[PDB]
Structure formats: structure tokens, C-alpha cells
């Protein structure tokens, strides 16, 4: 009961997905072969949420891997945990998208997509009651953004009543990796606005800051960064996988955190986060976790929560904890930091608690905030788009893939409207 | 510059023979043109209830039409000036509203029979326009679309299937691939629309044999130019828009069909979105401190209607209710919505 379907689109998305799978298999006591070697019966009770049971006491991720390039697939298959995936669930093209949203959405991606659709239909049929979909990808390139968006549109058309979740790695301001990133982000964000029910805005710059400042990590690799994201992902759906004292799944979270249809862009966070040295000089207690989570410098989106207000915040706690203590701490934070919370939604905080902690830790926390500061992310992007579009820079490539200028105009308008709406509700 | 103007009226249907045969009591009374009272049929057994007298539930309107009101009377005393606004180069919008089964389609649009005010709207439009046409050539174009699960069906020409919305240079809203018929008479547009009704998604629900599953949106564009076509012209394209709002639904207790549950939710969501858009437009029109974005984005209905809703336009909400206590709850909710559509405490 309550099966989730996982989709990974483009290189980054795939990489994050791999990490996610690795963590979750470890959590549920699943080895690199698909066999359960755990101790606790609780690890297998709700195994069906993320895994299909294959013949001969093995488990396989309900995961679809998508890319316009084959190399990524190979890299995944050769990775630790690569062999756990169903071979028929790898759907790859041969060409690539060349950082072009149009190639991913209209051309190469279009050709690819039917196969993916066929796979995912089968995966849906297999599951007794699919609660919904989780897509991991980025907005800045061509595949994850254009192809991903296309896929999402198709999915929603066939499953309009199911929950649609995306973990979207967004382009940061300073660390600009590509030149057409503004275009790709703009086009994809628009589509996300209409077709996702909740969107987790993850930002590389913020991750780097976390790694450098909070973990004090000498050399971050993408794997390390990805780990953080994976942890966050695991946090959200802990209530579907384990028992607890107060239980909240994907739907319950959405209903409590989304007051208006369009405002479904979250700034996620995780706690605790310490170095090796600073491990000894700390208190493993709920007050400390709470303190950590609400800090601006612990957000995985490059936005200052102190530049806006929280519309709603959901906190998900894992480990053996006193409910009273949890409640006290959340009330204290809202009373003390009154100015950071919208005053016309009393009790801006939703709490959920799962008894089963993550491995290595006795207590852990996951944060989901709907903050009006997310407007900053959109605004910058809009500005950059304007700067490009005013001089029609790089437009020709997109138009060569069948795209028309008017779409760009529309998307930009839409994003502007969204920004305005956030501002006004602040 | 939101200068939004919306009149709110309501038509009380005459109590039907079926309602009389079923013992229906008259919950609806009209005290004035401005107001209607719904007599909530409480048993009043407690001293508190007898003291509070909650039975007298008042709602605020510009014009409440009683049980004897006809399609011609609704036209003459409500949309008539909206037609004029379009003739004069402005946009205007009419919204039919109520619980499904309320008779919205027949009061406003018709379906071959019961011409509705839509016939009356076009009948005066064309008489006035044909007269004006002597100096200013007119092209009265007509489209008819279906807004269903946020997808748009071309009703006049179903071969375009389900369409999206796009922003114009100068950001108005266009439905892609919609058929536009240029007409000269009400007979042409009325038959065009009634034919288009054949392509609407409708189902035999418990509350209504013909329950619309969608918002039926008419877009009649009164395009004009001085007949001196060789001269530069500041032409007009006033849009006379009429919306058959999907009926409100709370029939999901028995409508357990997957699609009816989906449609129900999308209908109610978009009816509420319209409500929120109206509240915002009214607040801005009033000049309140609520300076913000009007949430047209919340539905395809409101995104499209933005072009009339946010400007120097005349709009009208026409609700449909019943005097019978047997449907008290539907009348109550219908009146409540309409009251909130107006947002004026004159009653
Ligand atoms: N947080 C992470 N970000 C990544 C990772 N790999 C790439 N990226 C970021 O994503 C962007 C590059 O995206 P992709 O390689 O996924 C583009 P994709 O392969 O999906 O389509 P193509 O345009 O066909 O290459 C850029 O901002 C990178 O800095 C990762 O492992 N973690
Ligand atoms: N006294 C007490 N209250 C509880 C307990 N568990 C949850 N609550 C309270 O119950 C309310 C939340 O409702 P739940 O019972 O968890 O929700 P539910 O009935 O399962 O409804 P859904 O999960 O929304 O389907 C809150 O006021 C909690 O504080 C408990 O063990 N004891
Ligand atoms: Mg790639
Ligand atoms: Mg419950």
C-alpha cells in the first residue's frame, strides 16, 4: 500500500538518484544484490513503498532512469549499487541535448519519451495503490529540464489525481555553470508551476556553503553534496516507511504547507550537521536540532529567510523524542522570531515524528519551509532572462529546434506574476 | 489600474410543480431589489435559537429577480449595459452561477430551446451594430470554448481538441487554435453556440441530467473599423464574454466515478479561484490597502478572463436559486457565493 514511483532525468538527477537509492537500501537493510540482510522486521514491513519484490527473495527499486546520453547509464550501472536497478528501466537516447531545453522538450526528448511513458505505465500497473511520483533533475541543462518537464506533463495527464513531487537543483547566482542556464531554468520553472504539486528547490551554492562553513569539509566532491540532498529526500518519506507517534506522508505535508495552488516551492533543510572535531562538544537534544534547523545558514536554497516571512514550515523528526519537548521548541521559535512568520496563519508550524532514526544517529530532523524569500531566486533568473532576451542572444539555436519567441515571452510573464504573488502575500 | 465594476444579480426560479408536490416551503423572500432573505427552516426549540432568530439570513445584491422574472427581464435589467460597453469598445463579462441543477444554462445560454439572455444579448448587439455598421464596418466574431480539467476544448470546432493559453505581445490571453466565426446576425451566433453545446462534456448526475462538467465560455468580438479601410484606424475589438460556470458540486457522496470526483474537484477549485480573483479585483477597485497581484493565475478561466476583469469593463454575476426548502442548502451556498462575489455590506 502507498507505492511511490521514482524518476531520474539527466546526469545530475541520475547521480542524485543513485545516492538516494544507496542510502535507502542501507536504511532498509538491502545489499548491492537486492537481498535483505537487515535485523529488524520494521525494515521490511513497508519495503513495497520503494521496492518491487522479485523472484528468489530479492528487492528492486521502483525507479526509472532517463538520459539523452548513454554514458551516464553506463556510469550508473558500474557504480556501487548499479546492479540493483532493473535493466529494462534504463531508458536512454544516443544524441544528448546540448544544454538546449528545446532539444529535450520538443525534439530528441519527444522521440525518447514514449518508451519512458510505457515503462512508467507498467510500473504503475504493478503497484496496488501508487500515491505518486518523485522526479530528481536540474533546471539549467537540456535533458533534466526539457525532457524532464515533458515527462512530467505526460504523467500528470494520465495521473491527474496523484501527487507530483520534484527535487530540482536550481541555478545559483554567483556559481553560473553555463551560459544559457537562465533560458533553460525559465522555460522549465514555468512548466513546473502548472504541473508539480510540490517542488524542493535545491541550490548548489547553498550546499557548498553548508559543506565549507558547517561541516568544515576540506574538499567537497559532488558525491558529498549529493549525500545531503539524499538525506533530505529520505526525511520527507520516513513516515511512509516506518511507524511513529505522529505520522505525516506526502499528501498531508502538501495540504499543510501549500495555502495557495501556485505557492509550492520549498526551501528544504537538514539537521544535525557537524564536523568530526565538533562532534564531542555538542548536546544531542531536541532544542539543539531545532536551533540548527531554523538558522538561515542551514538552508539548502541560496535565499535569506530573514529577507522574507515563512508562510508555513513542516518539521519532520526522527528518533525517540518527547512530543511535549518538540512542541515547546516549535512554539518558542515562533514566539521569539514573530517577525519571520506571517501573522495571519496562526501556528505556522506542522510537526511529524517517526520513531526510527537514520543510521549512526539517535536523533535527526528534516525541515521544509515555504518562505517568501524564494522570490529572490525567481527574480534574479527573470532579470538574467531579460538581459539575454532584450538582445535576442542565443535565441537562434532554440528557434532552430522549432521553438517560437512567444513561448519565452509567456514564460517570463508567468514567472513575473508568480514573483508578484509571493511578494503580495508577504 | 483596476477599475473593475461588477453588478451582482440573482434569479429566483418559480417553485416547480415537483417541489410543490414534495411539500416545499418558501425559504426565499425578496425584501428589496437590493436584498434577499433565505429563511433557514430551523425548528427553533431552544431559547437561544428563539432569541437569535437565525432564520433571517440576508444577502446583498444589486438586483434580486423574483419568481416571475423571465429571460427578457434578466436581460433588460442586467446585461443590457454590458452589451453597450462592448459596442462602445470596452470588454464585458457575464457569469452564470449556482449549484448544478440550478438552470444556469437555460437562463443564460439556452440549448436550441430556452434562448436565454445570450439570445437577448446578441439580438440587441446586432441591431445596434448593424445600425452603426453604416459608418463603421463591424466583424462580429464568435468563439466558444470549454474549460475542463484546466484544458480548453474548442466547442465550435472540436477538431482542435484540447488547447492551451498563451500571452499576446502586450500581454492579453489567446487560446491556441480556436475557431472564430465572423457573423452579421444573432441567428448565426446563437445557432453556432447551440450547435457548439453538442460538443460539451456533460453527464447524467443525480443533481442534474445535463450537469456541465466544464465552464462554457463564449467570446464574441465586436471588431470595428471606420469603413474608410484605406485610412489608419484605431480599431476596437471589444469582447462580450459569457461564461456558463460549471455547476457547484457536493454530490461526491454518490458520484464516486473517478472522473466525476476529478471534475468535481477541478470545478469547485476553479469556482473558488474565480471567487478569490473577484475578491481581489473588488478590493483593488474599492481602493483598499490590499495592493498585490490579482490571482488570475489560479485557473484557466481566470487567466483568460483577465483581459476584461482587470480593466475599465462592465461585468455581471447572475446567480440561479430555488425558493424550496427542499434545496435550502444549495440555495444557501449559491447565495453565499454571490454575496461574497459582491462584497458590499448594504444589507
Ligand atoms: N548538486 C549537484 N549538482 C550537479 C551535479 N552534477 C551536475 N550538477 C549541476 O547541474 C548542472 C549541469 O546539469 P546536467 O549535467 O544535469 C545537464 P543534463 O545532462 O541533464 O542535460 P544535457 O544538457 O544533455 O547534459 C550544473 O548546474 C551542475 O553544476 C551533482 O552531482 N550534484
Ligand atoms: N492525546 C493524544 N493526542 C494525539 C495523539 N496522537 C495524535 N494526537 C493529536 O491528534 C491530532 C492529530 O490528529 P491524528 O489523530 O494524528 O490524525 P488522524 O485522525 O490520523 O487524521 P489523518 O492522519 O489526517 O487522516 C493532534 O491534535 C495531535 O496532537 C496521542 O497519542 N495522544
Ligand atoms: Mg548530460
Ligand atoms: Mg492519521
Residue numbers in the entry:
A (entry chain H): 1 to 44, 47 to 360, 369 to 436
B (entry chain K): 1 to 347
Task: Tell me what the authors wrote about this structure, in their words.
To understand the molecular basis of kinesin-8B’s essential role, we characterised the in vitro properties of kinesin-8B motor domains from P. berghei and P. falciparum. The interaction between Plasmodium kinesin-8Bs and α- and β-tubulin is centred on helix-α4.
MT-bound complexes of Pbkinesin-8B-MD in two different nucleotide states—no nucleotide (NN) and AMPPNP—were imaged and their structures determined to overall resolutions of 4.3 and 3.3 Å, respectively. In the NN structure of Pbkinesin-8B-MD, density corresponding to nucleotide is indeed absent from the nucleotide binding site (NBS). The conserved nucleotide binding loops—P-loop, loop 9 (containing the switch I motif) and loop 11 (containing the switch II motif)—adopt a canonical conformation previously described for the NN state of a number of other plus-end directed kinesins, including human KIF18A. In this conformation, density corresponding to the P-loop is visible in the empty NBS, while loop 11 is retracted from the NBS. The C-terminal end of loop 11 adopts a turn and interacts with α-tubulin before it leads into helix-α4, a major contact point with the MT surface. The N-terminal peptide of the motor can also be visualised protruding in the opposite direction towards the MT-plus end.
